[PDB]
Design a protein around this ligand. Structure first.
Ligand SMILES: *[C@@H]1O[C@H](CO)[C@@H](O[C@@H]2O[C@H](CO)[C@@H](O)[C@H](O)[C@H]2NC(C)=O)[C@H](O)[C@H]1NC(C)=O
Ligand SMILES: *[C@@H]1O[C@H](CO)[C@@H](O[C@@H]2O[C@H](CO)[C@@H](O)[C@H](O)[C@H]2NC(C)=O)[C@H](O)[C@H]1NC(C)=O
Ligand SMILES: *[C@@H]1O[C@H](CO)[C@@H](O[C@@H]2O[C@H](CO)[C@@H](O)[C@H](O)[C@H]2NC(C)=O)[C@H](O)[C@H]1NC(C)=O
Ligand SMILES: *[C@@H]1O[C@H](CO)[C@@H](O[C@@H]2O[C@H](CO)[C@@H](O)[C@H](O)[C@H]2NC(C)=O)[C@H](O)[C@H]1NC(C)=O
Ligand SMILES: *[C@@H]1O[C@H](CO)[C@@H](O[C@@H]2O[C@H](CO)[C@@H](O)[C@H](O)[C@H]2NC(C)=O)[C@H](O)[C@H]1NC(C)=O
Ligand SMILES: *[C@@H]1O[C@H](CO)[C@@H](O[C@@H]2O[C@H](CO)[C@@H](O)[C@H](O)[C@H]2NC(C)=O)[C@H](O)[C@H]1NC(C)=O
Ligand SMILES: *[C@@H]1O[C@H](CO)[C@@H](O[C@@H]2O[C@H](CO)[C@@H](O)[C@H](O)[C@H]2NC(C)=O)[C@H](O)[C@H]1NC(C)=O
Ligand SMILES: *[C@@H]1O[C@H](CO)[C@@H](O[C@@H]2O[C@H](CO)[C@@H](O)[C@H](O)[C@H]2NC(C)=O)[C@H](O)[C@H]1NC(C)=O
Ligand SMILES: *[C@@H]1O[C@H](CO)[C@@H](O[C@@H]2O[C@H](CO)[C@@H](O)[C@H](O)[C@H]2NC(C)=O)[C@H](O)[C@H]1NC(C)=O
Ligand code: NAG
Ligand code: NAG
Ligand code: NAG
Ligand code: NAG
Lengths: 421, 162, 198, 49
């Protein structure tokens, strides 16, 4: 019987709180397919081949070939529209500065490598390596409009923009900002003050570098991490293969070769036999097209989700919970992949929590003092006020508290002095 | 049958006469006159598409054969096929009519070019410099979204029969 | 071409319906495509199979049309859900999601009706006329490090000010708009300066 | 065929006899006598709810 999870009862009481005293910078991945392979079929040559009176008989059925070709063309252009929507989000190609010092942060594992002939970042190269015949039946694969070089260039431009200019380049002109200051801004976004970053910058840089290395190793050593893209490839390949094997079926006819039937019988029943064969092949092709349409709709939904993720988690900071990775979102970096995109979500995670005794307000001289932004805590003898997401005890004064009424209405108010500077 | 017969490296056993493939089609065969091995490859084929700038501007067109090396068919060889009627241009502009594999075609005669990815830019990053706006601009944009399609109904007897 | 999507909806429906009506004049391997001529030409024993195959073909065409309509309806329903979310989040309020309600910082949007669709006019705030400055993370003063409360420290070359991030409006650095946290020995990049005490 | 016959302004050429719609069904016809031009419109029909 499968285990639901590890049992964990948390100690809840009406005057106890827990405040983290440390954190951990965590990096996660998220693989999303964007586009599937564009295929085109040759109806006249798949259905019949080299027989011309076969085409003459086919012409009497109607314009099924026209409808099939129109549907396939619509899917093919939809794939390119998906790629444009996801990736072509910046109209200017930014470049990283020649010097690669960003206050200790190490971005070599995601920035393009000039040594590689393809100018791809090491993680992009690993992703390409981790993801992997002749059909004369009339089934052809159209090349994508955007080559992998151009997608890599878009990704590099986005990385340079989000490194040198923060999120400003996603809402107007790019404005340069030193990276530690951008990181402080991003902490200030999630309710942790700037001094927290500035006083332990090197520790955070080391944590970020180690997390990036761990992600690279985890992708290298785990073959099932890129499952979704491989599922896309496998689905298309198996669909084409089933379509190919559908040719070796008699469909109830006495034989399954055009020349054999043309040579063995007279027209009066050869016509009926070929009608049966062509009808069967037409139903097979129609089924293939319908499945292609459904799969294309699903892939389009996934591509729209990926475009939203790129707009929100990359070109800015997202307050939505779990949308851009577990924990408090700091920033994310995109990486390209075959028929997909990979996000590296950098996030803030509290750790090393500590229990405390808390009170809703402080009664002093018949007045009730509430915290402006922090929370009242006490190690057991003295009271302090600290921000919620980090332990930074501060003396309770009249500048970090505000007065609201007397101390006769609040439930749980406690007695203490409030220092006045 | 119809195809191109080429010398084959296949080496099937003396009792073995024909050769099939995945799709159950004869792709290898042995000459009755002289016991040698041949491969059957279908003659070159592909789809053809027309690059038109619109009949309201001109009647010139550019023809794009798909997936054929045009030594076997103002001529340009791309990854998608061989393009005839348009000349390659070293410059780069935005994509007007998409061909494929990063090539786009436009009318100025009809020209084919590698699409310009974007207006190149480099921002001056340094570790003690910042840039702050001193002015703003109120911008208004549009966004068109379909909501509902036309409600339709059919009459089975009136259509299937008459 | 601004209204391409709605016209595409109309064109898709019209062309699908026209394909349905044109397919009605297809032989489907018959001697004749008019059921009346079939009825005035052959014995019922073979008129039966003639009509059978004709009717089966027409029914298959109608089934294909219905399936295409279902797929298009699902796509349009997805678009309509997106439009409802956009209306609720950009019109009935202000959204902080990037690029969801237009390029730039969103202020407000106004809806407009359209045939088989809706049109939004996203009003947005866009910065312009940027100016470079020299910045520092904190200010050291009497052994104390001062950080901005909501602003950012900038310098035009000789003097230091604190200003809001998205607009240039310099102010004198006082203890009102800055807060102290530790000494000025641990932070990297701190700069000496005075802090006016009101 | 079944329908309602109305006077038509369609200008048949002297050799033309019938009239076809998009679906290749007779729409306008010329009566054998009086050599007149007519339209064929199906009788009223619709759904019931
Ligand atoms: C803070 O104190 C509370 C209670 O004083 C701790 O809750 C107990 O933790 C121990 C540790 O294993 C458990 O065995 C007890 O069952 C908990 N109490 C209850 C009522 O469940 C809490 O763990 C302390 N915080 C930290 C971080 O240690
Ligand atoms: C917060 O946690 C970090 C690690 O998560 C602590 O840093 C470690 O400190 C010990 C002792 O100083 C070193 O041996 C380790 O090498 C450090 N880790 C890293 C990754 O550098 C840090 O000390 C914690 N802070 C507090 C206040 O407890
Ligand atoms: C940033 O990270 C890269 C990659 O980890 C570091 O490159 C390493 O450099 C050392 C010595 O220079 C070599 O022994 C390693 O083999 C390099 N790693 C790889 C994967 O080649 C680099 O030193 C780090 N720091 C900077 C400033 O780039
Ligand atoms: C709770 O915190 C206060 C403030 O740090 C502690 O009071 C100080 O404790 C240290 C260490 O014992 C002394 O050196 C200081 O003189 C104390 N300051 C004052 C004003 O008394 C207090 O001890 C802490 N409580 C507990 C139980 O650790
Ligand atoms: C907080 O302070 C107030 C006033 O100093 C305390 O109120 C007194 O409580 C005692 C004990 O019941 C009474 O005898 C006095 O008459 C009260 N005086 C006033 C002005 O209310 C209050 O008890 C203190 N809080 C706690 C928890 O003891
Ligand atoms: C603010 O000053 C910096 C440097 O003082 C400017 O950066 C230079 O801008 C010029 C403009 O053409 C470029 O040619 C240089 O290459 C830039 N320097 C570097 C190192 O790249 C910056 O442009 C100034 N800000 C504004 C708005 O003009
Ligand atoms: C901010 O930009 C606006 C326009 O984008 C500037 O307003 C213009 O000012 C000039 C000079 O006074 C006038 O000739 C124009 O007619 C104004 N434009 C409009 C639309 O009224 C404004 O001056 C800029 N801000 C600053 C501080 O210079
Ligand atoms: C930076 O800004 C300050 C504040 O405006 C400038 O200081 C003033 O400059 C004006 C004109 O030079 C003088 O009339 C004032 O008397 C100055 N005020 C003080 C308190 O000295 C400063 O000149 C600016 N620096 C530069 C390089 O332009
Ligand atoms: C910022 O100010 C501090 C204090 O005024 C300077 O620290 C002094 O530096 C000099 C030379 O480095 C030493 O001789 C003194 O002993 C230092 N005094 C103290 C109290 O630290 C510091 O150098 C200044 N920094 C800058 C960049 O101006
Ligand atoms: C606090 O909790 C204890 C036990 O959980 C309970 O007996 C007491 O009534 C509670 N008091 C308040 C003020 O919540
Ligand atoms: C086939 O017959 C010709 C004569 O007609 C002869 O020259 C040739 O050697 C024969 N081929 C073989 C393989 O025996
Ligand atoms: C800024 O970077 C340069 C090299 O790019 C370095 O010499 C300088 O020390 C850096 N400044 C700070 C404050 O780290
Ligand atoms: C010929 O047709 C016309 C049509 O109105 C009719 O009036 C006339 O009597 C017909 N002639 C004969 C001989 O029936």
């Amino acid at each position: 019987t499968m285990s639901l999870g590890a049992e964990n009862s948390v100690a809840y009481s009406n005057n106890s709180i827990a405040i983290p005293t440390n954190f951990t910078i965590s990096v996660t991945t998220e693989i999303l397919p964007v586009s599937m392979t564009k295929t085109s079929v040759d109806c006249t040559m798949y259905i019949c081949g080299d027989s011309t009176e076969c085409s003459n008989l086919l012409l009497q059925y109607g314009s099924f070939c026209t409808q099939l070709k129109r549907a396939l063309t619509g899917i093919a252009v939809e794939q390119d529209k998906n790629t444009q929507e996801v990736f072509a989000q910046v109209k200017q190609i930014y470049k990283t500065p020649p010097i690669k010092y960003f206050g200790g942060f190490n971005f070599s594992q995601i920035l393009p490598d000039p040594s590689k002939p393809s100018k791809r970042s090491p993680i992009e190269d690993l992703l390409f390596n981790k993801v992997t015949a002749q059909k004369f039946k009339g089934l052809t694969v159209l090349p994508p409009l955007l080559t992998d070089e151009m997608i890599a260039q878009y990704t590099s431009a986005l990385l340079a923009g989000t490194i040198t200019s923060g999120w400003t380049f996603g809402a107007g002109p790019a404005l340069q900002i030193p990276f530690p200051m951008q990181m402080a801004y991003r902490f200030n976004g999630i309710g942790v003050t700037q001094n927290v970053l500035y006083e332990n910058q090197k520790l955070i840089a080391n944590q970020f570098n180690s997390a990036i290395g761990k992600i690279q190793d985890s992708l290298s050593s785990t073959p099932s991490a890129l499952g979704k893209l491989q599922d896309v490839v496998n689905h298309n390949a198996q669909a084409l293969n089933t379509l190919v094997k559908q040719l070796s079926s008699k469909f109830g006819a006495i034989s399954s070769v055009l020349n054999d039937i043309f040579s063995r019988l007279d027209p009066p029943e050869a016509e009926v036999q070929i009608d049966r064969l062509i009808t069967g092949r037409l139903q097979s092709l129609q089924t293939y097209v319908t499945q292609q349409l459904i799969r294309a709709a699903e892939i389009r939904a996934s591509a729209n989700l990926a475009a939203t993720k790129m707009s929100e988690c990359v070109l800015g900071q997202s307050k939505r919970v779990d949308f851009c990775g577990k924990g408090y979102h700091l920033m994310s970096f995109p990486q390209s992949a075959p028929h997909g995109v990979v996000f590296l979500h950098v996030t803030y995670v509290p750790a090393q929590e500590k229990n405390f005794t808390t009170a809703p307000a402080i009664c002093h001289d018949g007045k009730a003092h509430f915290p402006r932004e922090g929370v009242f805590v006490s190690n057991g003898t003295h009271w302090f006020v600290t921000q919620r997401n980090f332990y930074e005890p501060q003396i309770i004064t009249t500048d970090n508290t505000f007065v609201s009424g007397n101390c006769d209405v609040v439930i749980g108010i406690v007695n203490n002095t409030v220092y006045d500077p | 049958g119809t195809g191109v017969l080429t010398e084959s490296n296949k080496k099937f056993l003396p009792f073995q006469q024909f050769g099939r493939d995945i799709a159950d089609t004869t792709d290898a065969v042995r000459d009755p006159q002289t016991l040698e091995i041949l491969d059957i490859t279908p003659c070159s084929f592909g789809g053809v598409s027309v690059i038109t700038p619109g009949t309201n501007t001109s009647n010139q067109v550019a023809v794009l054969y798909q997936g054929v090396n045009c030594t076997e068919v103002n001529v340009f060889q791309t990854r998608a096929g061989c393009l005839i009627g348009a000349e390659y241009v070293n410059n780069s502009y935005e994509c007007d009519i998409p061909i494929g594999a990063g090539i786009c075609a436009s009318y100025q005669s009809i020209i084919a070019y590698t699409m310009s990815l974007g207006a190149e830019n480099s921002v001056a990053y340094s570790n003690n410099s910042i840039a702050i706006p001193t002015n703003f601009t109120i911008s208004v944009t549009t966004e068109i979204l379909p909501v509902s399609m036309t409600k339709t109904s059919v009459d089975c007897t009136m259509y299937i029969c008459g």
